[PDB]
Design a protein around this motif. Structure first.
Motif, mmCIF file in Angstrom:
data_model
loop_
_atom_site.group_PDB
_atom_site.id
_atom_site.type_symbol
_atom_site.label_atom_id
_atom_site.label_comp_id
_atom_site.label_asym_id
_atom_site.label_seq_id
_atom_site.Cartn_x
_atom_site.Cartn_y
_atom_site.Cartn_z
ATOM 1 N N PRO A 48 -9.772 10.893 -23.230
ATOM 2 C CA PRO A 48 -8.765 11.353 -22.610
ATOM 3 C C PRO A 48 -8.235 13.184 -23.352
ATOM 4 O O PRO A 48 -6.967 13.231 -23.736
ATOM 5 N N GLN A 49 -9.258 13.546 -23.472
ATOM 6 C CA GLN A 49 -9.257 14.910 -23.248
ATOM 7 C C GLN A 49 -9.150 15.443 -22.239
ATOM 8 O O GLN A 49 -8.275 16.239 -22.043
ATOM 9 N N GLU A 50 -10.473 15.725 -21.295
ATOM 10 C CA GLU A 50 -10.891 16.320 -20.248
ATOM 11 C C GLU A 50 -10.510 15.133 -18.741
ATOM 12 O O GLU A 50 -10.045 16.078 -18.128
ATOM 13 N N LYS A 51 -9.884 14.124 -19.616
ATOM 14 C CA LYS A 51 -9.046 13.455 -17.763
ATOM 15 C C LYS A 51 -7.722 14.388 -17.533
ATOM 16 O O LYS A 51 -7.735 14.579 -16.146
ATOM 17 N N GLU A 52 -7.412 14.854 -18.529
ATOM 18 C CA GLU A 52 -6.229 15.329 -18.511
ATOM 19 C C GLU A 52 -6.612 16.369 -17.107
ATOM 20 O O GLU A 52 -5.363 16.666 -15.791
ATOM 21 N N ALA A 53 -7.379 17.297 -17.339
ATOM 22 C CA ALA A 53 -8.027 18.294 -16.538
ATOM 23 C C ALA A 53 -8.776 17.633 -15.353
ATOM 24 O O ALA A 53 -7.343 18.704 -14.586
ATOM 25 N N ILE A 54 -8.591 17.110 -14.710
ATOM 26 C CA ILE A 54 -9.874 16.306 -14.287
ATOM 27 C C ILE A 54 -8.273 15.441 -12.901
ATOM 28 O O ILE A 54 -8.188 15.748 -12.300
ATOM 29 N N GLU A 55 -7.772 15.093 -13.471
ATOM 30 C CA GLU A 55 -5.912 14.378 -13.300
ATOM 31 C C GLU A 55 -5.535 15.514 -12.229
ATOM 32 O O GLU A 55 -5.170 14.811 -11.050
ATOM 33 N N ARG A 56 -5.236 16.462 -12.804
ATOM 34 C CA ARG A 56 -3.992 17.569 -12.048
ATOM 35 C C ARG A 56 -5.365 18.460 -11.442
ATOM 36 O O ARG A 56 -4.801 18.379 -10.300
ATOM 37 N N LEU A 57 -6.748 18.109 -11.265
ATOM 38 C CA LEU A 57 -6.790 18.146 -10.771
ATOM 39 C C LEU A 57 -7.507 17.916 -9.058
ATOM 40 O O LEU A 57 -7.367 18.196 -8.320
ATOM 41 N N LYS A 58 -7.955 17.111 -9.150
ATOM 42 C CA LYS A 58 -8.353 15.915 -7.596
ATOM 43 C C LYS A 58 -6.214 15.291 -6.810
ATOM 44 O O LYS A 58 -6.214 15.565 -5.978
ATOM 45 N N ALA A 59 -5.857 15.848 -8.101
ATOM 46 C CA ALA A 59 -4.458 15.924 -7.586
ATOM 47 C C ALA A 59 -4.046 17.231 -6.868
ATOM 48 O O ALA A 59 -3.071 17.512 -6.056
ATOM 49 N N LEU A 60 -4.589 18.364 -6.948
ATOM 50 C CA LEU A 60 -4.276 20.214 -6.467
ATOM 51 C C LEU A 60 -4.674 19.302 -4.660
ATOM 52 O O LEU A 60 -4.882 20.476 -4.306
ATOM 53 N N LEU B 138 0.561 -1.154 0.023
ATOM 54 C CA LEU B 138 -0.253 -0.002 -0.091
ATOM 55 C C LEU B 138 0.872 1.400 0.053
ATOM 56 O O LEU B 138 1.074 2.038 0.240
ATOM 57 N N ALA B 139 1.703 1.086 -0.677
ATOM 58 C CA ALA B 139 2.901 2.277 -0.601
ATOM 59 C C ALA B 139 4.129 1.649 -2.040
ATOM 60 O O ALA B 139 4.933 1.876 -1.834
ATOM 61 N N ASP B 140 3.218 2.493 -3.001
ATOM 62 C CA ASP B 140 4.661 2.567 -4.628
ATOM 63 C C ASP B 140 5.807 3.011 -4.402
ATOM 64 O O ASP B 140 6.490 2.742 -3.747
ATOM 65 N N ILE B 141 5.376 4.215 -3.986
ATOM 66 C CA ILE B 141 6.470 5.214 -4.142
ATOM 67 C C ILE B 141 5.715 6.961 -3.359
ATOM 68 O O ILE B 141 6.157 7.552 -2.345
ATOM 69 N N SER B 142 4.616 7.706 -3.773
ATOM 70 C CA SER B 142 4.034 8.579 -2.849
ATOM 71 C C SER B 142 2.479 8.070 -3.546
ATOM 72 O O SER B 142 1.568 9.570 -4.177
ATOM 73 N N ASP B 143 1.278 7.416 -2.919
ATOM 74 C CA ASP B 143 -0.078 7.463 -3.252
ATOM 75 C C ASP B 143 -0.405 8.668 -2.546
ATOM 76 O O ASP B 143 -1.480 8.219 -1.559
ATOM 77 N N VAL B 144 -0.314 10.002 -2.746
ATOM 78 C CA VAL B 144 -0.937 10.860 -2.158
ATOM 79 C C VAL B 144 -1.111 12.039 -2.296
ATOM 80 O O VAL B 144 -0.134 13.113 -1.837
ATOM 81 N N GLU B 145 -1.641 12.145 -3.753
ATOM 82 C CA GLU B 145 -1.773 13.804 -4.388
ATOM 83 C C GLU B 145 -2.666 15.143 -3.844
ATOM 84 O O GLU B 145 -2.124 15.950 -3.447
#
Length: 363
Positions: A318-330, A291-298
């Motif tokens: 694959p177009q809007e996913k980039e916006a969500i990926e960085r969103l839930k990551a912030l 449960l700890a690959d390298i940094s599972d906590v964005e």
């Protein structure tokens, strides 16, 4: 035709021979042994004196221009054949004119050869050059330009198998055997020149650009719906495996005592342990899972991804996913991002830009 020869022996005993006017004096030495006999006429001291210099046995008679009117004082001394004639210590010397004076050591060694007067003692090189052949320095065009050989680099990889040890160093890539050494004999017997001149340079691969290996299909599991009815997970969490994973962590004798006690009591796993004894035991001492690959906590703690099979109305692209990926990551929400995205121009700000200005911090 012939010619008598006046033979004179130092003993004052002269006679006459004849043989031919062109026979090697070697026959003379043998002619004297038969002419006078072999009682005191050996060959070692056989010197045919005709006028001072003893005629040798390497020239045909008459070559010295002897004269029958004269006499050849042939000598017959030097008796060293193991055991022959000798002389006692009690005797008188007979060398009035040739009296010895200096005491030169015949045996032993020594370099007695001092230069005359005081001049250049050392003598480097010489001052003359007697040519042996009549036409040795001939020709004109150069045929062998030997102006220094070439060492180059050879001991670079050759070992017990020399080029074969390197043949495996390159062949292993997937080449042949005779084609590799040839590549290692004209490029530099190395994986650098050989490879380059093994297929792209050697006459075995004209522009090899038809082998695309950009697939990367080693790790790609779905992990979306591949789990159900597994005779191995229920035990790993039940007291059955817990007793086999706890007793094994102290004594390997319990593994068998347990596999035969509990491991051999529930058929739910036995029908698989008979063929999974390798994997089932691999987990007994070291179960997989992390449960700890390298940094599972964005965002906050770190989720997994889409854990909702057939639940939402859409599936993102694959177009809007980039916006969500960085969103839930912030640190953004989940359903509030996938939806709010359609704010004004389907951009990444109108929807987010307004969301951030609405969050604020404190007034």
């Amino acid at each position: 035709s012939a010619v008598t020869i006046t033979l004179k022996t130092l003993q004052q005993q002269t006679f006459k021979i004849r043989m031919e006017p062109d026979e090697t004096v070697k026959v003379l030495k043998e002619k004297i042994e038969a002419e006078k006999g072999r009682d005191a006429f050996p060959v070692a001291g056989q010197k045919l004196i005709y006028a001072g210099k003893i005629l040798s046995d390497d020239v045909p008679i008459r070559d010295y221009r002897i004269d029958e009117k004269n006499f050849v004082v042939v000598m017959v001394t030097k008796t060293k054949a193991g055991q022959g004639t000798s002389a006692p210590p009690e005797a008188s010397p007979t060398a009035a004119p040739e009296s010895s004076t200096s005491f030169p050591p015949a045996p032993t060694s020594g370099m007695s050869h001092p230069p005359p007067a005081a001049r250049e003692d050392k003598s480097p090189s010489e001052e003359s050059a007697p040519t042996t052949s009549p036409e040795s320095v001939s020709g004109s065009v150069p045929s062998s330009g030997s102006s220094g050989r070439e060492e180059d680099a050879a001991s670079t990889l050759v070992t017990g198998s020399e080029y074969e040890t390197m043949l495996t160093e390159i062949m292993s890539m997937g080449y042949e055997r005779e084609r590799v050494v040839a590549a290692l004999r004209a490029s530099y017997n190395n994986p650098h020149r050989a490879v380059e001149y093994l297929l792209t340079g050697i006459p075995g691969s004209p522009e090899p650009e038809h082998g695309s290996v950009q697939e990367s299909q080693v790790s790609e599991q779905p992990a979306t719906e591949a789990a159900g009815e597994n005779p191995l997970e229920f035990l790993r969490d039940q007291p059955q495996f817990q007793n086999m994973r706890q007793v094994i962590q102290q004594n390997p004798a319990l593994l068998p005592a347990l596999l035969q006690q509990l491991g051999q009591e529930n058929p739910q796993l036995l029908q698989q342990i008979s063929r999974h004894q390798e994997q089932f035991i691999q987990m007994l001492n070291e179960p997989p899972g992390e449960l700890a690959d390298i940094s599972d906590v964005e965002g906050e703690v770190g989720a997994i991804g889409e854990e909702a099979p057939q639940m939402n109305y859409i599936q993102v692209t694959p177009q809007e996913k980039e916006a969500i990926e960085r969103l839930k990551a912030l640190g953004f929400p989940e359903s509030l991002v996938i939806q709010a995205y359609f704010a004004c121009e389907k951009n990444e700000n109108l929807a987010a830009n307004f969301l951030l200005s609405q969050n604020f911090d404190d007034e």
